[PDB]
């Protein structure tokens, strides 16, 4: 639902089988929290994968300079 840093997902899709299922699929990603900011100290964001790995090449700061600004 979140993965805040990055968008998210929760888009639907149909999970076909052998030929076809007109069913539906959805909810993905995950969560976690408690991220230590070099500054004061951690607010627990509920990012997920692709969100967690993002806080790496990036920052922790710029990775937050948005969930604030905008």
């Amino acid at each position: 639902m979140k993965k805040d840093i990055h968008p998210k997902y929760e888009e639907i899709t149909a999970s076909c089988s052998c030929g076809n299922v007109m069913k539906i699929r959805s909810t993905v990603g995950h969560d976690l929290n408690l991220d230590v900011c070099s500054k004061c100290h951690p607010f627990f964001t509920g990012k997920q994968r692709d969100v967690a790995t993002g806080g790496r090449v990036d920052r922790f700061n710029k990775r937050f300079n948005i969930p604030g600004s905008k």
Binding site: V36, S38, R56, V57
Partner: protein, 149 residues
Amino acid sequence: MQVILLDKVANLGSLGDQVNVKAGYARNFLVPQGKAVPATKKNIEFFEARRAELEAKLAEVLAAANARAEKINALETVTIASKAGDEGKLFGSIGTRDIADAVTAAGVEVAKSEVRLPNGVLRTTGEHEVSFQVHSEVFAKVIVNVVAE
């Protein structure tokens, strides 16, 4: 797989590893409160200043301490008689003081902790050799002589 400890802690690295390090291990422990690391351009170069400024010594510091053998060699003969007497021996004690202190007979001063002579000097009056040993990197040469009075 890329960090910079600097503050080694049982890790296969000291002063910060510049080559493949552990990963995910620092995301929550090492980096937080422990030894921050980000071996990413920015932080990297910034460490060089913390080290390259330590090596400038071999170039600069060595120089501010190597002129020793050069600053003191042409020295005028050290004329510090060590109370030569006793039917052919001496009275003065030749050990550490007269060796080094033989320089401020005009002004300049040194440190008695730089002498280079394994055996104590036989209490003679001859050409007392004094191999000034300021630093391992640079050695110098001094002399000492005793006179009669």
